[PDB]
Amino acid sequence: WGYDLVHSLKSPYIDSSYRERAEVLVSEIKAMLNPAITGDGESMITPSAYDTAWVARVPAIDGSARPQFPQTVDWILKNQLKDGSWGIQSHFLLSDRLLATLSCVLVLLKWNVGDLQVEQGIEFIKSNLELVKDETDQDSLVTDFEIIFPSLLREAQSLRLGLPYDLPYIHLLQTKRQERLAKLSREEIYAVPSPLLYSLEGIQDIVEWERIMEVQSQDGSFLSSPASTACVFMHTGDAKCLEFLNSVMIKFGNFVPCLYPVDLLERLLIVDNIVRLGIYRHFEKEIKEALDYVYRHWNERGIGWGRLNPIADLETTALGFRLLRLHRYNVSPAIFDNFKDAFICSTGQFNKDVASMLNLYRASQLAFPGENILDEAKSFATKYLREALEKSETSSAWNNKQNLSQEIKYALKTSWHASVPRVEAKRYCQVYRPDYARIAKCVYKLPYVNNEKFLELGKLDFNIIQSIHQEEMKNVTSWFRDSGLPLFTFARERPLEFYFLVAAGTYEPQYAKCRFLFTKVACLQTVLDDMYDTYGTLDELKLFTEAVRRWDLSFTENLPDYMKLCYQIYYDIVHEVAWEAEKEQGRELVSFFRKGWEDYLLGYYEEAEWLAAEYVPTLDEYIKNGITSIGQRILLLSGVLIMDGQLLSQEALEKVDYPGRRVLTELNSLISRLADDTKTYKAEKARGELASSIECYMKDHPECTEEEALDHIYSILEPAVKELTREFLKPDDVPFACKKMLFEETRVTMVIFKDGDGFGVSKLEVKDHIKECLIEPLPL
């Protein structure tokens, strides 16, 4: 550990060639994304054999005995898979292959073509249906499979095709179809848009075609589905339906996808993946352009996956809420009222429902003060997700291949606030799939979202940043060794731990000085802390505290030897930080730093007076002192004022730092103090130590239990965390890098003190985080 471990690291990724390569990947990605963000190549989505067959059904509008879109028939004839099914070869999903293959077989028969393809398709359907033994054999279901397949299969039956109509699995599907159709509000199909509009081709006996146009989308589609739209067209001759089908053929040539457009969901998925991979700083322009487009379409009624959908989609809306708020757009959680009754969204296909609830769960964590609906949403989504873990569908072959249960479990154990940013990006680089397949009416892919380039850059960029940090850690440990700080054997050496505290969140190459000075101050503080609350006597501390007031090295003659050394190091670190800050900021700051340091150490001294007198403060007194004496304020200032290119006027600084006000540095101090207490108070009790916030509350409330005491401390933390989030994301004219640096240090602090029971900080967890974040590179 420490010096020896760090100087033994020799990362190759520090060489300029690796960053030059990463820059080529960045340019390649910008080019790849340009059509989706700036051009007209939006909605890049794979073919739906199922939907393409429905479009192929449409007869020529001139009344002749041939398809209106003959190119779709040719596509179908040329794209059969080797086993006789139609679908995407890379992924096998039984229900997808069954639906698509039966769909294709029937349209080839309609036009009396493809004898061989039909024969092979029928064989695939028969043989695979006969392999189904029980329900747990069916695997994941494409959207509305239970409704559509029995309908399509009855069409085949009327043609007397050689299919096993009497299989128990087939009877079960008809049973499920009835179960679904029973909850249907039929009169309302015509007045209130609903998810069933996506699949009208499966409920043809139910729909009064003469009434259905009232819920058609503006582009002429029925909920973006080419198949459903084609069906309505064949029954009505509706001109707008035909325009939609034409527009999709024009865009894709000789096939159609199962959803179109997917302009809103695709943009949001692009941004989500770039952010989660940790590569977002290379794509500020593209992310703004994507989110700007989403925001233009953002409205009080929510958003669908496509901007023309006549009903909002929880998946897209929750994802949009989160990314918009995260990028400082003004959104209200009131949009989730669109998904409420008397919450629901427990209808639909399983992966979509799970996705919607994962997105709602994540969105709920970005709550601002007073946003009760998000607390409710968090509770609801958590319950939903824990239930989903217990459902058989979660363990289907398809879901297991994508580690769905693992993903749900990880989401539930992961708090956005209590996250290590660099570590989350590293972990996501290990989960992200370039060939990820999604489910709707058919299995599909979105290549702008899931591709090899994103991951290549993610892994390389992570390794390069890490290698830069490793060189910085050599500098840190080298400075530490020669600094004099190791001479204080009453304190533990933790330079890498403090470097991690800042570097795991504020990682960008240009902020090396920020990280370095932050680390120096944190190393100094840990010695000062031990000196004031443990090692020093009150009379010694009174002397040291007087020296603090005087800012005079000559006055040090009066101090004990160890304090002479401590004062010298402190004095030097304070003024190095101040000089660097004055250089960056172009204004005087020595006086401002000196006052910050005096208030901090005078805080320690008040605390030391209490300890010596065995005085237990009121909780008000304790928190008042603790916000000042915890030391986060002056530590944060020692980093935030020295960020390359980030100018903070006095006016701007006061927006994020102002003792006595609920601004970022104050909220961090408060959260740190109380979070620490929640994590450690029991160890300090059994050690006969200085009272914590818990003990202070119990003195204030002699009748209350320890449990009630801890509960109260949490009732203070939770509101503070919400305020911290709003202060961070709030639109203002404070350089955002500075706000982010403050917030991210808080997030890493919250990781260290998470799950506050008794009981102590986990030294092993800390070491493991440092290993993962700073020591071990990603394999390429």
Ligand X SMILES: CC(C)=CCC/C(C)=C/CSP(=O)(O)OP(=O)(O)O
Nearer residue to Mg ion within complex by CB, 117 or 680 = 680
User: Which value, in Å, is the radius of gyration of the alpha carbons in the chain?
Assistant: 32
680 in a labelled binding site: yes
Smallest distance from ligand X to CB 755, Å = 15
Q: How many angstroms separate the CA atoms of 520 and 472, rounded? A: 12
**Site residues (vs ligand X, CB under 6 A):** 492, 526, 529-530, 533, 676, 760-761
Q: Which is nearer to ligand X, 199 or 629 (CB)?
A: 629
> How many angstroms separate the CA atoms of 779 and 251, rounded?
39
549 binds, among ligand X, Cl ion, Mg ion, none (CB under 5 to 8 A by kind): none
Min separation Cβ 739 and Cl ion, Å: 37
Point out the residue whose Cβ comes nearest to Mg ion: 680
Cα atoms in the 13 Å half-sphere on the side-chain side of 590: 6
Q: Does the footprint of Mg ion cover residue 680 (CB under 5 A)?
A: yes
CB 544, min distance to ligand X, A: 16
Of 176, 226, 239, give the one whose Cα is nearest residue 200: 226
From the list 16, 15, 6, 17, the residue with the least C-alpha distance to 471 is: 6
CA distances from 760 to 262, 420, 622, 650, 768 (A): 49, 19, 20, 39, 16
CB closer to Mg ion out of 666 and 676: 676
With binding defined as CB under 5 A, does residue 529 bind Mg ion?
A: yes
Q: Residue with CB nearest ligand X?
A: 492
Q: Which is nearer to Cl ion, 88 or 517 (CB)?
A: 88
Minimum CB–partner distance for residue 136 and ligand X (Å): 49
- Does residue 676 belong to the site contacting Mg ion (CB under 5 A)? yes
Q: How far apart are CA 128 and CA 169, in angstroms?
A: 12
Considering CB distances under 5 to 8 angstroms, the limit depending on partner class, which of ligand X, Cl ion, Mg ion, none binds residue 43?
none
Short-list 106, 35, 45, CA closest to 439: 45
Nearer to ligand X, 51 or 606 (CB): 606
Nearest approach, Cβ of residue 629 and ligand X (Å): 8
Q: Which two tokens stand for residue 154?
A: 């009855």
- Point out which span in 123-131, 526-534, 589-597, 632-640 binds Mg ion (CB under 5 A): 526-534
Does 533 belong to an annotated binding site?
yes
Q: CA-to-CA distance for 381 and 359, rounded, in angstroms?
A: 9
Q: Which does 761 bind (CB under 5 to 8 A by kind): ligand X, Mg ion, Cl ion, none?
A: ligand X
Structure token digits, residue 649: 């006027």
Residue with Cβ nearer Mg ion (433 or 492) = 492
- If one counts every other C-beta atom within 10 angstroms of the C-beta of residue 699, the result is 15
Rounded to whole angstroms, how far apart are CA atoms 389 and 400?
A: 12
Output the smallest distance, CB 756 to Mg ion, in A.
10
- Helix/strand/coil (H, E, C) string of 120-165? HHHHHHHHHHHHCCCHHHCCCCCCCHHHHHHHHHHHHHHCCCCCCC
3-state secondary structure of 443: strand
Minimum distance from CB of 672 to ligand X (Å)?
9
For ligand X, the closer of residues 444 and 488 by Cβ is 488
382 in a known ligand binding site: no
Is 51 known to sit in a ligand binding site? no
Distances (CA, A) of 688 to 328, 616, 706: 47, 13, 16
Torsion of CA 81, 87, 93, 97, to 10 degrees: -80
* 3 Cβ neighbours under 8 A, 6+ residues apart: 477, 478, 480, 481
Minimum Å gap between C-beta 634 and ligand X is 14
Beta bridge partners of 67: 59
List C-alpha distances in Å: 141 to 54, 96, 712: 19, 7, 47
Least distance from ligand X to the Cβ atom of residue 377, Å: 35
Nearer to ligand X, 533 or 582 (CB): 533
Q: What's the rounded Cα separation, in Å, for the pair 302 and 382?
A: 22
Secondary structure letter of residue 691 according to DSSP? P
- How far is 676 from 753, CA to CA, in rounded Å? 6
Q: Which does 436 bind (CB under 5 to 8 A by kind): Mg ion, ligand X, Cl ion, none?
A: Cl ion
The yes or no reply on residue 146 touching Mg ion (CB under 5 A) is no
Least Cβ distance, residue 27 to ligand X (angstroms)? 46
Bridge partners of residue 443, in order along the sequence: 439
424 versus 533: smaller Cβ distance to ligand X:
533
At its nearest, how many Å lie between ligand X and the CB of residue 488? 11
Please identify, using beta-carbon distances, which residue of 27 and 403 lies nearer to Cl ion: 403
Which one of 155, 471, 533, 609 is in contact with Mg ion (CB under 5 A)? 533
Q: Select 271 or 750, whichever has its Cβ closest to Mg ion.
A: 750
Angstrom distances, CA of residue 375 to CA of 183, 372, 381, 711, 727: 30, 5, 10, 17, 19
Q: Which residues bind Mg ion (CB under 5 A)?
A: 529, 533, 676, 680
Annotated binding site for Mg(2+): 529, 533, 676, 680, 684
Binding site: which residues?
Answer: 529, 533, 676, 680, 684
